[PDB]
């Protein structure tokens, strides 16, 4: 409604241009979501979400402010959001998925570049993004080439604190890294000023580790044939992870979760289940970047899982409680360096992963997916097919972007291996 | 002579693909190199080292190996020479440079990527390099996205030893990267067994000491009007510093810079006065990836500096002595985090390392040159230019890769930029 005009005035957003990014957004939820049946009932608080993506989340994260509370921006899961919440200050996840905004991006980046970084850039530079002209502050980390050396650039027109994250898992990394998330605590207390104790940690702690198993009962749930639910409304649910209130979000999720249980009850499913099973491996899909996805289950397929940080690389791994603050920033460090990304290496945990849900999930085949231009991903898919191919699981290497020029090819390919199997 | 061919099948060269590698080089090098007047008498050494580039060293390099010495490949400026030149063992740098190889690095790595990786990759995969089949071991580095994680996959081909260099150059970083370069002399003691000493580690530190130090002398030359020396020379000496003898390329390196001492006084120089002079910076560029000084000094303009790690970055700075062994493997980690490279956060200081040059030269133009996906030379431009531009530095951002596809739109690019100079 007019009420939200009224905050992006406020927040000095490019009116026309962010009426223009969101101008498609409608028919293409449509299609892809709206108007494909079988669809649980609890979709509709997430559907409802998108349909007011700048509205009602926007006033309360402003509304926050005016309280002396803070929003921190991030683009990894390993900035501890657990630390963020303990102040009570919002966390808020944004990375790029949309087309609309990367040329925005390539005045200061170059075009040979991954487009979830160019597309983050472009919102904030021009001013599109009412999430972006409502945070504070970004929290940037040294995972690739191109994030490390844009937040030097993006720091010119939001403050950007830089978080060294290691490339080993060794001793020598794993106390570097304590070290650095003890450096970013003391960076959030004197921006909030707010001090942690052991009563508001453990709290932030519950609160990200309660939305994280949300998350990850709804994983558990796509491993039953026939599959519940679409892959593409889990992947919309887990990209709103990243800008939800964290209570309100694991309580809808939660409910979504009831409504499968009775699905998979009754032996109800959104596709028959001799349809083939894919689990998607590779780099985040942020939303609303919903290609792949579509494709493949506009194919006859339907996406069981998502090895990737917009999926099981975000919710697996929980913060194990300590009594005292010292004890408990130690292991929010510890639980973000079990996350097996590909900048890390060797990364033979990651395979050690697939392999776990290819068994668990009953997939049928392998579609290893990732950005144009992400480099650690790119690389490591060539070890990471050779081992599924070994074991004889279907592997197809897909790479693209957020433009749709490529939907075609991209739909002939995915079509090829979906009837191969 | 047939004794080089002897020893390429004893170490499993690919002679037919090996023999196609190098059949074009003698054509390149009369024209770039040979049919050029006003070369200094002193280029003979290093023109019968291009001439001669698998036969003599290779030769020296297994015989070494015969007297249980071993061979190091590296691929970074940050490795440790002094360390390994301490225990009688070599150090070569084997940066790929040739097109030739590109394809049979792309048979395991993305075709998105550095040429520089691919190149490399491709030769030790194919076996056609003898300095790659000569050599024991690789040390990698965790520097950019595509060497980290191109290591995983040569390391089945070559054992390879990995340095994880920090990505800031804070007080913690400081520490990290005298542990990992402690680490890596336990490394090479045990795999020479050659314990470190005083003496040992004094004599390494001196020998690499000075080859840079005779690298430097010839930078330093390159300041006068009118240039006493093509730049295109200068980069063919500063390339082969990472195969030859220490003690016998810095001696030759002298003995051109007194010859080019004798052009200096007598006003004689290789262009006219009222030539335009460039400062290359950006990324190396290794043996035989001459294409864009060709094209500068072709166009009439004269290269004078290179800022870059085949170039000024190598061997600007040196390793201060100390007294014992742990304060001299302090000191050689110390002087190699004084390297710039992009690869680090922030990097302001190679802008002032690029401004200083500038001054120091008489620079009329900036050409700044990266490989085609170097993601962080290619982010970092931005920064670059914009202070150059701020001074009204004339600047030019040049990207390319090893193919000769784009001679001719680089070609008048270059041309455009020194005529508007």
């Given at each position: 409604g007019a009420d939200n005009r009224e905050l992006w005035k406020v927040l000095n957003v490019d009116l026309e241009k962010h009426d223009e990014f969101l101008a498609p957004v409608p028919a293409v939820y449509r299609e892809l979501f709206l108007n494909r049946p079988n669809r649980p009932r609890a979709m509709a608080y997430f559907d409802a979400v998108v349909g007011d993506i700048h509205g009602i989340r926007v006033h309360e994260l402003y509304n926050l402010k005016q309280e002396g509370k803070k929003v921190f921006a991030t683009f990894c899961?390993?900035?501890?959001?657990?630390?963020?919440?303990?102040?009570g200050s919002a966390c808020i996840g944004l990375c790029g998925g949309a087309q609309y905004t990367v040329p925005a991006g390539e005045t200061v980046l170059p075009r040979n570049l991954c487009?979830?970084?160019?597309?983050?850039?472009?919102?904030?530079?021009?001013?599109?993004?009412?999430?972006?002209?409502?945070?504070?502050?970004?929290?940037?980390?040294?995972?690739?080439?191109?994030?490390?050396?844009?937040?030097?650039?993006?720091?010119?027109?939001?403050?950007?604190?830089?978080?060294?994250?290691?490339?080993?898992?060794?001793e020598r990394d794993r106390k570097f890294w304590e070290e650095?998330?003890?450096?970013?605590?003391?960076?959030?207390?004197?921006?909030?000023?707010?001090?942690?104790?052991?009563?508001?940690?453990?709290?932030?702690?519950?609160?990200?580790?309660?939305?994280?198993?949300?998350?990850?009962?709804?994983?558990?749930?796509?491993?039953?044939?026939?599959?519940?639910?679409?892959?593409?409304d889990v992947l919309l649910i887990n990209q709103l992870a990243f800008f939800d209130d964290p209570e309100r979000f694991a309580t809808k999720v939660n409910e979504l979760c009831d409504e499968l249980e009775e699905r998979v009850a009754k032996g109800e499913g959104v596709v028959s289940k001799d349809a083939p099973r894919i689990l998607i491996t590779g780099t985040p899909q942020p939303i609303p970047h919903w290609k792949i996805h579509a494709l493949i289950e506009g194919a006859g397929g339907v996406v069981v899982g998502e090895e990737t940080c917009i999926g099981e690389r975000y919710f697996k791994d929980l913060v194990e409680p300590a009594a005292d603050v010292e004890g408990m920033l130690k292991n929010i460090a510890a639980r973000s360096l079990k996350v097996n990304c590909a900048c890390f290496t060797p990364n033979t945990g990651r395979l050690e992963d697939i392999l776990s849900m290819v068994q668990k999930l009953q997939v049928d085949g392998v579609i290893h997916y990732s950005l144009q231009f992400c480099q650690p991903y790119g690389v490591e898919s060539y070890l990471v097919g050779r081992e599924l191919e070994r074991r004889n699981i279907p592997f197809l290497k897909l790479e693209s972007d957020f433009s749709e020029e490529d939907q075609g090819q991209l739909k002939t390919r995915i079509e090829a291996f979906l009837e191969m199997i």
């Open positions: 899961v390993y900035v501890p959001e657990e630390i963020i919440n303990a102040t487009p979830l970084i160019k597309s983050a850039m472009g919102f904030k530079i021009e001013r599109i993004c009412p999430y972006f002209q409502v945070a504070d502050y970004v929290v940037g980390e040294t995972t690739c080439d191109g994030k490390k050396k844009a937040w030097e650039i993006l720091n010119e027109y939001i403050p950007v604190y830089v978080m060294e994250l290691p490339q080993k898992k060794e650095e998330i003890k450096d970013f605590a003391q960076f959030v207390e004197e921006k909030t000023g707010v001090k942690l104790n052991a009563e508001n940690l453990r709290a932030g702690i519950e609160k990200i580790n309660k939305k994280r198993k949300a998350l990850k009962r709804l994983s558990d749930l796509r491993k039953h044939n026939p599959a519940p639910i679409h892959g593409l």
